Write an enzyme that holds these catalytic residues in place. Sequence first.
Site, PDB file in Angstrom:
ATOM      1  N   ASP E 112      19.530  82.000  52.342  1.00 46.22           N
ATOM      2  CA  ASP E 112      20.855  82.583  51.575  1.00 46.22           C
ATOM      3  C   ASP E 112      20.543  82.169  50.063  1.00 46.22           C
ATOM      4  OD1 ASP E 112      22.162  83.119  53.991  1.00 46.22           O
ATOM      5  OD2 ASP E 112      22.761  81.008  54.027  1.00 46.22           O
ATOM      6  N   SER E 137      21.154  82.464  44.447  1.00 46.70           N
ATOM      7  CA  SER E 137      22.286  81.829  45.609  1.00 46.70           C
ATOM      8  C   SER E 137      23.168  82.945  45.688  1.00 46.70           C
ATOM      9  CB  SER E 137      22.769  80.653  44.688  1.00 46.70           C
ATOM     10  OG  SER E 137      23.485  79.841  45.832  1.00 46.70           O
ATOM     11  N   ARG E 138      23.313  83.321  47.069  1.00 46.30           N
ATOM     12  CA  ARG E 138      23.963  84.428  47.517  1.00 46.30           C
ATOM     13  C   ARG E 138      25.199  84.016  47.905  1.00 46.30           C
ATOM     14  NH1 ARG E 138      21.570  89.032  50.147  1.00 46.30           N
ATOM     15  NH2 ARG E 138      19.335  89.211  49.846  1.00 46.30           N
ATOM     16  N   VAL E 139      25.741  82.778  47.913  1.00 45.00           N
ATOM     17  CA  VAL E 139      26.964  82.258  48.126  1.00 45.00           C
ATOM     18  C   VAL E 139      27.676  82.419  46.762  1.00 45.00           C
ATOM     19  CG1 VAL E 139      26.090  81.017  49.925  1.00 45.00           C
ATOM     20  CG2 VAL E 139      26.624  80.055  47.594  1.00 45.00           C
TER      21      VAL E 139
END
Lengths: 262, 261, 134, 138, 273, 135, 42
Positions: E112, E137-139
């Site tokens: 992720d 950081s895909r979150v």
Amino acid sequence: ALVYGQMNEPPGARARVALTGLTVAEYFRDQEGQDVLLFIDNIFRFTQAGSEVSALLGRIPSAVGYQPTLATDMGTMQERITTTKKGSITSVQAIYVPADDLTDPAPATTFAHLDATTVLSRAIAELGIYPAVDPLDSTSRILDPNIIGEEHYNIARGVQKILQDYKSLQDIIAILGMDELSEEDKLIVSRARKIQRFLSQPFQVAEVFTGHAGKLVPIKDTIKGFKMILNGELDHLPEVAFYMVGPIEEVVAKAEKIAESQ
Amino acid sequence: TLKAVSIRLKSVKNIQKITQSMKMVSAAKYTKAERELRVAKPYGQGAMKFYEKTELKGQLIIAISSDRGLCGAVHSSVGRQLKADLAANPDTMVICVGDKIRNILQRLYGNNLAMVCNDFGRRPPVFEDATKVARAVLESGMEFTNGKIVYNAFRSVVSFRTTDIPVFSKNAIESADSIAAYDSLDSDVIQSYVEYSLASLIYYTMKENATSEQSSRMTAMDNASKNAGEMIDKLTMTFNRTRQAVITRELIEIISGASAL
Amino acid sequence: QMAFTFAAPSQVFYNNANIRQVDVPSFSGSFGILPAHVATLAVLKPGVVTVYQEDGSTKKYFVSSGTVTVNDDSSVQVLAEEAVPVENLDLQAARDILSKAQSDVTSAGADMLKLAEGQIAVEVGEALVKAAEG
Amino acid sequence: ASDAAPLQYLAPYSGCAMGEFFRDNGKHALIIYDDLSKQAVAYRQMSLLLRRPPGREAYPGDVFYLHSRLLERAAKMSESNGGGSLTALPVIETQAGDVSAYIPTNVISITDGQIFLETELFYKGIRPAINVGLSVSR
Amino acid sequence: ASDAAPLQYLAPYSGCAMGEFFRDNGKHALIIYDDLSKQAVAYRQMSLLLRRPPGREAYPGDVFYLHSRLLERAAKMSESNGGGSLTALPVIETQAGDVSAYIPTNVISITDGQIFLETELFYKGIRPAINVGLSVSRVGSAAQTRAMKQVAGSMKLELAQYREVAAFAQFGSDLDASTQQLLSRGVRLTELLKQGQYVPMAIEDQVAIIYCGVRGHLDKVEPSKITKFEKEFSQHIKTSHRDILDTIAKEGQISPDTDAKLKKVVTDFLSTF
Amino acid sequence: VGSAAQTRAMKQVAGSMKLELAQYREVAAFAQFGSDLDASTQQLLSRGVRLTELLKQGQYVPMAIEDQVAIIYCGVRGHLDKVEPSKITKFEKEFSQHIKTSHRDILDTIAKEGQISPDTDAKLKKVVTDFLSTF
Amino acid sequence: QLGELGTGAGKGGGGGGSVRAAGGSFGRREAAEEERYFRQKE
């Protein structure tokens, strides 16, 4: 409808889950007579899973490590996505390009089946324009004056040419300033910024996260609206009135509201 | 190999970034310099009008350059024109403004160099620097009857021409044939007018040379950035072909070893 | 028909514009210029160059030094070191520099060069006092 | 593209036989192979699934003979053979304008000249985007 | 490395099951795989010696499946499942920065987000050598506190602007005032992110030091004294102005009133500093 | 193997040559855009250019070790700075002939000594200057 | 033939930045201007 072939699944499951979603879409086309949308995400992982299956079966891989049946594996799936006499299936496929190489066998085989292209650019999103579709990098095969129409094609080519002139004049403005070619390039830069704002649009599925009610612009309202901006019929309106409004009547209504509030 | 292309592609990418940064800076300087050249060109037209009306025909040579090099073919071609002067007037002392002209011409005619000005080019040319050169010509006491100033004319954005502006002396002005038609002439009037006409011609060349130098440096970095951009695209395709060929060749070697068992 | 080329290192005023009269303060006397003037040339001094165009408009341009040349083809080339309109000048500043110049003259003593510089600034200050108060 | 690789391999030879009917009967035929780069991919699939040794870009060694035995059947016959002819227009798709790749260089060494189409000219509105300096008719 | 290849292949799954005990019992676990590159080498050794068909770089065709079925077990469980979590930090060693190699390509696709490290940034003094333009950081900022999200959004925007005009800052000294301000601010923020080894700092200390970075409190100080300002001003607000830290902790953000109080504290400290 | 594979006379002149070629390598790049150079730097550039032209050799003509040492010794002691590089090969044949039939005692002196003494260095320099005057 | 400075890292002469590692003629230009400056200083 979702079919969700997950990453922690064996390569056989990830290779066939595009066929599972295609089968659901084929029912809605053949047994309902509809125009179905099919979303494949990701089409590179469909290729990657097929390469893993052929490696598991012991087949000798082709160039750059892909499966020898790469074109046939792609072709068998992609040729079921078409218009028939009952309905159609239209496929929007997320595409990953490995190592930023368009000559790689996985995108090169995929690009042989594509009829359009929608590039989502983060640079467009940084300007506040949503949806962040790049107006120049996004292409289509049916952008010809025989499939869509003569007025559609001419207005689209004029919009592309205006935005290309804006891109070619952005460095000149950045170096010298807004004073260039009296009021000719000033007219071009004013229309082009109005074009960029009018490409933005509120979405109904995001109307509770942004507060703006979504719009579904018909094709004739789009062609009429961009023809008005290209003809200079709205040079007396601010560029803010073109932002996040669907129809061109929303633009003039927003400009009137600004003029009344001012 | 793949490593050699990757190293070369990284270097050309850095070359393009530097030249693009240089192009933006030099375009800013050229825009500012051409803005002031738009008003300092008729200033030299009025200054040269008197010498045009006298029709006086020609020692000392003024060379306009800068300590900032790599601006194109400015100092090389101006020095080449100066070399042609060394083949035409070998006994003429030359006053240079810039180290690059001194570097080129010292090997050939180091015996015919009066003075070379340095620490010049980074600052924009103003009248005070022109007066510094003007005071240098006067107080040195060097004998000169005729003369000329070497500078890069501003023909266009991409074209600059190396011409010469003739500069005469007080003694030559008094001995002129058509100077008798001009009245109110005494020693102090002629002396002060000549030593200010010189500082108005030097200021005119300094504005023309600065604009021509920035224009040449701008179009040189523009050509360098375009050529580096083309070389990046060809090296990127070569890198992609070599990367794919390495993967294919390595796998065929593994397959051949596996099949031979 | 009188071509005017009044320029400066800072600004540019006229370029081949027909002017009825320009009066120039020169070292050869604060004389005046009319079209088809005497072929001559002279050296500017601190004073008020005036411009009287074909419409009779009066404009005052104080300069600090320069050159004045009139050729036989009725072409006027007045180049000055820093030509400004006199409206953006202060008589109080003129006397402040003049008083400063007087201090330089009194404190020059045996420094004859500094005595000359005090005299030069005295001439400039006196020129601006008449310029600003007139 | 949905058909099997042997069908895509066979189809140029099937069409050539249909065109060779007109050539051998005094008539004239034009044939277009659109495209032979995809037939080489189909033949590479058949060769790799037959465990044949891959070569350049995993192609078999007889991928030149694949196109050479096909295109050599396009010929102009003499008057003693009826005077007929078969004209071939093979199509080759390059990658980023690379005519130095393995398969296009093979077909260039077979055919009697190439018509090169440029992506740069096609973007500028020049249609047909024929490169005049790089188009040869032997 | 002295252990057998099956033991090196099985160790990430053994550690994951140990971390899954905490995840399934309502607790929160963090698992570090240091490193997954050598586990794939051990699995390749077994597959090649079992006469399994090799693929790219002689890896088996189920080496993506090896790492995907490991890394998908890191999950944030629902509140009906106890609310536990398992956080994975896989480590991949790349060869000469080739992130397009086969094993790094797989793990980049699975995870992720990435934290890229470069040796070029490492020897420039940037330690930890995180490439901000490459690390994702895909979150996003959903995994940050309110105070951190407030300040890191402006820091990310300012550092992006600095990297845009980073070419001019190498030689250009006679630039415009805005470009000089952008490069000077980015130098302060780049020096701000440098951190020593084995000394992690609390979220209040991190927010406070990068609040001073993005609010122009460090534009008047030299970059060489930023680290000394980081520790000494932290002491100045930990035992002399504790009421401001209490208000920030109570409200979870920095109000404009607390912003003005911090401005006065910085100005008074920089008079002494 | 290094200098252990060279004789004593060659080791004496190849070590000085390797230093001068290293110094020439530092200053050989100045011909790209440099125009004014220091007098010592110009002498280093000129001597190194002579040394690079000294290392050139035709095919099927291997020369003896005494000829190689003598020519390299002249190259690194400035004995060829006044000679154009195009005539280095002509000097390499004719001057070696001059010190062969006339100054063979010096060759015997170097062979018995095994190296270059300062007296022999002065004698060879005087023959070089005498030959260059006759050249 | 001596491995001129800037001709390439591991190619006979070079070592340094990306241009010097790539070699060719720009690495020669970098070595020429740098050595000219430090020879002028000495």
